[PDB]
Design a protein around this ligand. Sequence first.
Ligand SMILES: *[C@@H]1O[C@H](CO)[C@@H](O)[C@H](O)[C@H]1NC(C)=O
Ligand SMILES: *[C@@H]1O[C@H](CO)[C@@H](O)[C@H](O)[C@H]1NC(C)=O
Ligand SMILES: *[C@@H]1O[C@H](CO)[C@@H](O)[C@H](O)[C@H]1NC(C)=O
Ligand SMILES: *[C@@H]1O[C@H](CO)[C@@H](O)[C@H](O)[C@H]1NC(C)=O
Ligand SMILES: [Ca+2]
Ligand SMILES: [Ca+2]
Ligand SMILES: [Ca+2]
Ligand SMILES: [Ca+2]
Ligand SMILES: [Mn+2]
Ligand SMILES: [Mn+2]
Ligand SMILES: [Mn+2]
Ligand SMILES: [Mn+2]
Lengths: 233, 233, 233, 233
Amino acid sequence: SNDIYFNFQRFNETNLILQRDASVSSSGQLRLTNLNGNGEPRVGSLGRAFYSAPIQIWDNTTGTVASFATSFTFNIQVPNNAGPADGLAFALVPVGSQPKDKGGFLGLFDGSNSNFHTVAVEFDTLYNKDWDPTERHIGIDVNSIRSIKTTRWDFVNGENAEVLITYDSSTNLLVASLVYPSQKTSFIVSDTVDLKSVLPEWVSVGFSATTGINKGNVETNDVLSWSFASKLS
Amino acid sequence: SNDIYFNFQRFNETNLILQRDASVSSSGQLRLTNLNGNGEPRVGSLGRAFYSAPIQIWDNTTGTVASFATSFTFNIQVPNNAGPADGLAFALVPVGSQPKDKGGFLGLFDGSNSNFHTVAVEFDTLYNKDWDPTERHIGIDVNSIRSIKTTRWDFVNGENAEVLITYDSSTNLLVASLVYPSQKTSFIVSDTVDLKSVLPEWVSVGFSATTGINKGNVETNDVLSWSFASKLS
Amino acid sequence: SNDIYFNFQRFNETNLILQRDASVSSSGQLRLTNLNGNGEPRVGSLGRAFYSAPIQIWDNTTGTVASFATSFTFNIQVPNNAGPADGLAFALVPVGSQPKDKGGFLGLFDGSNSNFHTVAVEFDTLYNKDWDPTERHIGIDVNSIRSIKTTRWDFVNGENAEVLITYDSSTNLLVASLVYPSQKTSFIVSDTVDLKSVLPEWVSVGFSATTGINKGNVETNDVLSWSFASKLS
Amino acid sequence: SNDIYFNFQRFNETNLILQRDASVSSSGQLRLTNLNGNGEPRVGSLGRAFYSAPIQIWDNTTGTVASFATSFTFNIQVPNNAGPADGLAFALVPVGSQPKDKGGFLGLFDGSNSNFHTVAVEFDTLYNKDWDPTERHIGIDVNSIRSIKTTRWDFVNGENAEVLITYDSSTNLLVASLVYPSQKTSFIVSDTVDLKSVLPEWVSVGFSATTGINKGNVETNDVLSWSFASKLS
Ligand SMILES: *[C@@H]1O[C@H](CO)[C@@H](O)[C@H](O)[C@H]1NC(C)=O
Ligand SMILES: *[C@@H]1O[C@H](CO)[C@@H](O)[C@H](O)[C@H]1NC(C)=O
Ligand SMILES: *[C@@H]1O[C@H](CO)[C@@H](O)[C@H](O)[C@H]1NC(C)=O
Ligand SMILES: *[C@@H]1O[C@H](CO)[C@@H](O)[C@H](O)[C@H]1NC(C)=O
Ligand SMILES: [Ca+2]
Ligand SMILES: [Ca+2]
Ligand SMILES: [Ca+2]
Ligand SMILES: [Ca+2]
Ligand SMILES: [Mn+2]
Ligand SMILES: [Mn+2]
Ligand SMILES: [Mn+2]
Ligand SMILES: [Mn+2]
């Protein structure tokens, strides 16, 4: 068994790969998106962050896949007289992977057709006519910004959201859940995903987020703590 | 920190406290309720099982409460031309605690008024006019068979259900979730519970289950694996 | 895998089996032997303590043996103008097992010939002509008070000793080590032991200790913290 | 608490930083030093390997230090009619750290006076008049190839050695032990080390090894498995 486990209750940039607007505040928070400087979520911001060490999600010589679980607490805040956009997502991406489109694409996809060998659990705050369900949701994305399945998520501005995502090698079951300790509300989604089919044996694990590309559609995308655990074979 | 952690992928009666009809099959399964000829769920069956070592859930001298998480896989099967009844539940009970009423009371409650110092997460399969919601559900019970909160549970006969219950000391948040890997369906409930108020410092941890008290209302109540983890202070 | 893990940084009698003079101080310490009011270690004291839940060390149907590790901190104190006696030991004993002889037998053995199905790691403080090496030692005992192997242990009165015992199923290697953080001294012993041959599938895990049976040979035998971990199959 | 834990029972170069002659065999072994025309330890070889993600060993803002433990299995083999040289060592080094001198310096030190902010546990196989004890040993090195303390190590050619190194934040106690499951022999060393004084807050964790710089003094320096665990605050 080749295990890996880490838990960050305070972030620091030395063991993180930051891309674009991603940055770690002096207070130890992982801030995925910018500020127009005046303390307001910048428009058209895109930021990604990954753990500096690759994780082996599956082995092609033994044919085994890893089981994993991750939990993190994020906080999305929308400024007065503005709307949430575009969202935040946990993602398993190819090691050297570079950022993609802004806005509705969450920095993870193109809208083109290139195989992104990407799997992500998104927390969509803005409705996109072309592929999104009508209400804000939690979705499991497998190579497309069009979730393979979703669930209604009743977004609450400024409240800490606690997430738990788990993958089981045997059942190929991916389960994502979110709860607002303050609201005592909870949501859960689950579907089967075959990681061998879409992901490369080694992947970089992390977050990606974006703000709307239009003046009044912005939000902050901060992660306050994160823990990941993976067991292979 | 006084921790405890165990994981049983196969049960054996030597480190278990069995009550009434509870028993461990030769195949290592924890069978909470009886059977009879042919191999049918006996009517009016009641069985409880606990880990033979007490767990300290909170300390009155330091004022701290433990955080815990448990996960188990159960399988409820209803025989042809019969209906599910009455249910199964994970419960934290007083150490010497003895069984209570059958049927709708799940062997955990009376319907009287005695403080049972019991907290349980139930998986109710039968509707009880007097206190149950109309549909089958998952409920958090705090001293009463009348759940302090519930959620719709779409019961699937004969399919393995995977449960995850977690309690957080800081937020006093109890979260129970269930998923059917085969159906890819999931359900989640959450509410705040102050364990210091209702539970004694030391409790026995385990399961309780019953079958209907009427001819055509029976089911099997088997637990296939179980893991518990508790951290105090 | 049927795992078990616990860690006590403060003892309490509700999840412990105490035998004879064993007791838990108000300060949360496991005191294996008595005191005589004058504050001095009683003469001819014998006390044993075990975790209230049996542990499965091996399975005769699958032929597998468990790997385990335990660590604890003990403190032996000798009163002025007196000598250490008789010792302290960590032991895996049969579930219902009752105490044996006092003094040099550490409460674990007879000197007769009954198979005790006992395995213990002793911390011998008194020399017994008949079977002990000349100097104080750490010894691995397999069914006899005559250690199957030992190592010189330079006893330091009143200083906290930190112990680590580990057993590996594959290599059948038992390794015991002790260190005095204050003295920066360390000792280690290792030998192979086939647990299937001497131990019953289920055992009670714990400590045993005694004081000399002669006026000026006494000591305190206190355990300050304890953690055990076992993985089967 | 900012934790980190990994366990490699088979190495792969994608999550490793390899320096000089270090390499990962097709069979998944971390081979620190080179070979020859045929499996002959090359002369004057030097190789180092670290985990690709920095580890935070202490925080200067909170003043806390991390506790850690690592265990690995290495195998040193000397070719017929040749002698062991120079040794192998586990080390905590500065993040960008580059290799140092060959031979007796184990690739970790200079013999000059530059502060290397390095701490290592060495497994010295060759006697160096100037600073080494007469017999082969295990030594704790704090900024100098001259160990701050050592212990006799009875080297056994070609046998797998199992190592366990642990550091305790509270007692500042570093304890290194080695055992030869096949020989049933064991060795242990312990001394206090203040990591804040010598190490930078973030360090790269890994191995370093070298072979003699003279024709008949060579050995292989292979690590077969490795697990590291660190807990900060
Ligand atoms: C990360 O740790 C280094 C340690 O020197 C410190 O200088 C830096 O400020 C830290 N960054 C944050 C965001 O805490
Ligand atoms: C439980 O263990 C006992 C003793 O080893 C054995 O007799 C019994 O068959 C076991 N039960 C199961 C289900 O393995
Ligand atoms: C252990 O807990 C019980 C119940 O809370 C209490 O009565 C007892 O005094 C405790 N024992 C010690 C030694 O603290
Ligand atoms: C390292 O991983 C790659 C796959 O990403 C594989 O081709 C290579 O064989 C691996 N090396 C070892 C020693 O397992
Ligand atoms: Ca969207
Ligand atoms: Ca009911
Ligand atoms: Ca003796
Ligand atoms: Ca040397
Ligand atoms: Mn969406
Ligand atoms: Mn109900
Ligand atoms: Mn002895
Ligand atoms: Mn040396």
